[PDB]
């Protein structure tokens, strides 16, 4: 019908003819046959993007200090499952809800028992994904409550918009990175009496996206010096930028919560019973999409952590631990998914919020 208060109507019931809203369409830096031939694919990305837009609006209305990180992720994911109309691997969540705090830039979500509470001075990166038929939206924004971080957030938002504007068919990936760094490094911020020039986090990257494949193998650098590989017609990219007051480099840190089957590993016969059962659970529920330990718990799984280690040591699954700059530093992120269509560039996850 029309969407409800706390949103509860699936996006497919809001648009009954199966035609979903376009995102921001941009001339490259006009009605092809080739573009129209892939219309069912662009449409699937747009259904996933509208879910993402409606979920994040809802999240911005209630996220507050005092909530636990588990409470925040569970409330967000509940809404996302409802609006995407979760249906096995045909529609659902593409990857776990990131809510990385402070010096941590990516790949933290709480595991069971985590008592972390969101604080007034925290800078929290909300990064979550939706998909229809494997067509994935990766889009992320930063949440703050103290106005002291406003210029750091504006620097990163401007750098992400700069990378989105530079992107195009036949554009060299190294040129997008050099562009993003020049804008991000034009910002200086002052936080609690200390001044900083904002630094891109040089070992974090954007990435191409493939069907059921969050990282399809091409990386989008956010500093100069990368590869001159060109972007191609038909590719889809997550253009993401990260900025920091610290060293501008991340390392692995904290407990791991995010995992994903290696895309190129084939069928592996396993006899160990608990390891075989967990691999079957992952193949049925996630396939090649990323998952977290809270999502195994929700399925009624327990006593799985050694079976999960076994699958990692066999190379069937890869762990993706949180990625953090040095203690005391502040990091921020903004990201959109773009489609490199034959007739135009589409920023499919653009909203009136960012
Ligand atoms: C999750 C994510 O999208 C985050 C941003 C991208 O990550 C990276 O660029 C990874 C760099 C890691 C560097 C580690 C250095 C360690 C040094 C040390 O410990 O000494 C992005 O990848 C381009 C990444 C992702 C897409 O690849 C992940 C798959 C997605 C999941 C798990 C949700
Ligand atoms: Co992301
Ligand atoms: Co991403």
Residue pair 253/108 in contact (Cβ under 8 Å)? The answer is no
What is the rounded distance in angstroms from the CA atom of residue 16 to the CA atom of residue 26? Answer: 27
Residue pair 117/67 in contact (Cβ under 8 Å)? The answer is yes
Binding region for substrate: 107, 215
Q: What separation in Å is there between the alpha carbon of 335 and the centre of ligand 2?
A: 7
Rounded to the nearest angstrom, the gap between the alpha carbon of residue 232 and the centroid of all alpha carbons in its chain is: 22
Which residue has the CA at smallest separation from atom 28 of ligand 1?
215
Rounded to the nearest angstrom, the gap between the alpha carbon of residue 259 and the centroid of all alpha carbons in its chain is: 14
Residue pair 121/146 in contact (Cβ under 8 Å)? The answer is yes
Which one is catalytic: 175, 335, 336, 346? 335
What is the rounded distance in angstroms from the CA atom of residue 168 to the CA atom of residue 345? Answer: 7
Q: Tell me the chain's radius of gyration from C-alpha atoms.
A: 20
Which residue has the CA at smallest separation from atom 15 of ligand 1?
251
Residue pair 331/143 in contact (Cβ under 8 Å)? The answer is no
Q: Where are the domains positioned within the chain?
A: 40-247+327-350, 248-326
What is the rounded distance in angstroms from the CA atom of residue 154 to the CA atom of residue 140? Answer: 14
Which residue has the CA at smallest separation from atom 8 of ligand 1?
204
Minimal CA–CA distance to 220: which of 241, 201, 234? 241
Residue pair 104/254 in contact (Cβ under 8 Å)? The answer is yes
Closest ligand 1 atom to residue 129 Cα is 33
Q: Report the greatest alpha carbon distance in the chain.
A: 60
What is the rounded distance in angstroms from the CA atom of residue 69 to the CA atom of residue 323? Answer: 17
| Residue showing tokens 């080739």 | 34
Query: How many other CB atoms are there within 10 angstroms of residue 24's CB atom?
Result: 15
Binding region: 107, 127, 138, 207, 215, 240, 335
| Residue showing tokens 């699954």 | 317
Which one is catalytic: 50, 158, 175, 240? 240
Regarding beta strands 323-324 and 251-252, do their DSSP bridges make them parallel or antiparallel, or are they unpaired?
A: antiparallel
Residue pair 346/339 in contact (Cβ under 8 Å)? The answer is yes
Under 8 Å CB-to-CB from 151, ≥6 apart: which residues? 187, 188, 189, 190
Under 8 Å CB-to-CB from 147, ≥6 apart: which residues? none
Q: Which residues line ligand 1 (CB under 6 A)?
A: 95, 106-107, 203-205, 207, 214-215, 219, 250-252, 258, 260, 290, 320, 323
Q: Is 284 a catalytic residue?
A: no
Closest ligand 1 atom to residue 207 Cα is 23
Q: What separation in Å is there between the alpha carbon of 274 and the centre of ligand 2?
A: 31
Which one is catalytic: 44, 47, 127, 325? 127
Under 8 Å CB-to-CB from 283, ≥6 apart: which residues? 261
Which of 73, 92, 107 is the best mutation target for the ligand 1 pocket, counting ligand atoms within 8 Å of the beta carbon and taking the most?
A: 107
Backbone angles phi, psi at 147, to 5 degrees: -70, -10
Residue pair 270/311 in contact (Cβ under 8 Å)? The answer is no
Helix, strand, or coil (residue 330): coil
Which one is catalytic: 25, 215, 253, 277? 215
Residue pair 78/51 in contact (Cβ under 8 Å)? The answer is no
User: Which pairs count as long-range contacts for 14-23, CB under 8 Å and 24+ apart, including other chains?
Assistant: 14/50, 15/47, 15/50, 18/43, 19/43, 20/46, 20/47, 20/49, 20/50, 21/46, 21/49, 21/50, 22/46, 22/346, 22/348, 23/49, 23/346, 23/347, 23/348, 23/349, 23/350
Q: What separation in Å is there between the alpha carbon of 50 and the centre of ligand 2?
A: 16
Q: Is 207 a catalytic residue?
A: yes
Written out in words, the top-level CATH class of the domain with range 40-247+327-350 is: alpha beta
Written out in words, the top-level CATH class of the domain with range 248-326 is: mainly alpha
Buried (b) or exposed (e) across 266-282, using 16+ Cβ within 10 A?
eeeebeeeebeebbebb
DSSP string, 191-254: ETTEEEE-EE-TT--EEEEBTTBS--S-EE-SSSS---PBP-TT-EEEEEEEEESS-S--EE-S
The β-bridge partners of 345 are 26, 340
Under 8 Å CB-to-CB from 312, ≥6 apart: which residues? 259, 318, 319
* Residue 219 exposed, middle or buried by CB count within 10 Å (0-12, 13-18, 19+): middle
Minimal CA–CA distance to 96: which of 60, 122, 118, 70? 70
Minimal CA–CA distance to 174: which of 163, 185, 165? 163
Q: Is 251 a catalytic residue?
A: no
Which residue has the CA at smallest separation from atom 11 of ligand 1?
204
Q: Is 215 a catalytic residue?
A: yes
Which residue has the CA at smallest separation from atom 17 of ligand 1?
251
């Amino acid at each position: 019908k029309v969407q409800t208060d706390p949103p509860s109507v699936p996006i497919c019931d809001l648009y009954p003819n199966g035609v979903f809203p376009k995102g921001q369409e941009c001339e490259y830096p006009e009605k092809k046959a080739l573009d129209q031939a892939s219309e069912e694919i662009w449409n699937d990305f747009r259904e996933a993007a509208e879910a993402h837009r409606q979920v994040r609006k809802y999240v911005m209305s209630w996220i507050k200090p005092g909530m636990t990180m588990i409470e925040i992720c569970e409330k967000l994911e509940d809404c996302s499952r409802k609006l995407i109309k979760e249906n096995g691997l045909n529609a659902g969540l593409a990857f776990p809800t990131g809510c990385s705090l402070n010096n941590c830039a990516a790949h933290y979500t709480p595991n069971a028992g985590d008592t972390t509470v969101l604080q007034y001075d925290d800078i929290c990166k909300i990064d979550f994904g939706t998909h229809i038929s494997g067509r994935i939206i990766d889009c992320a924004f930063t949440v703050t409550f103290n106005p002291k971080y406003d210029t750091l957030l504006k620097a990163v938002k401007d750098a992400t918009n700069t990378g989105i504007k530079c992107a195009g068919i036949d554009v060299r990936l190294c040129d997008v990175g050099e562009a993003i760094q020049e804008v991000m490094e034009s910002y200086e911020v002052e936080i609690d009496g200390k001044t900083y020039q904002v630094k891109p986090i040089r070992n974090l990257n954007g990435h191409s996206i493939g069907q059921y494949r969050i990282h399809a193998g091409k990386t989008v650098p956010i500093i100069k010096g990368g590869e001159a590989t060109r972007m191609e017609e038909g590719e889809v990219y997550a253009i993401e930028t990260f900025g920091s007051t610290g060293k501008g480099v991340v390392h692995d840190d904290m407990e791991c919560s995010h995992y994903m089957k290696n895309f190129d590993v084939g069928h592996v016969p396993i006899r160990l019973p608990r390891t075989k059962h967990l691999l079957n659970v992952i193949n049925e529920n996630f396939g090649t999409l990323a998952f977290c330990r809270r999502w195994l718990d929700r399925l009624g799984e327990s006593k799985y952590l050694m079976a999960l280690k076994n699958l990692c040591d066999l190379g069937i699954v890869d762990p993706y631990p949180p990625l953090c700059d040095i203690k005391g530093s502040y990091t921020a992120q903004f990201e959109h998914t773009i489609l490199l269509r034959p007739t135009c560039k589409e920023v499919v996850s653009r909203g009136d919020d960012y």
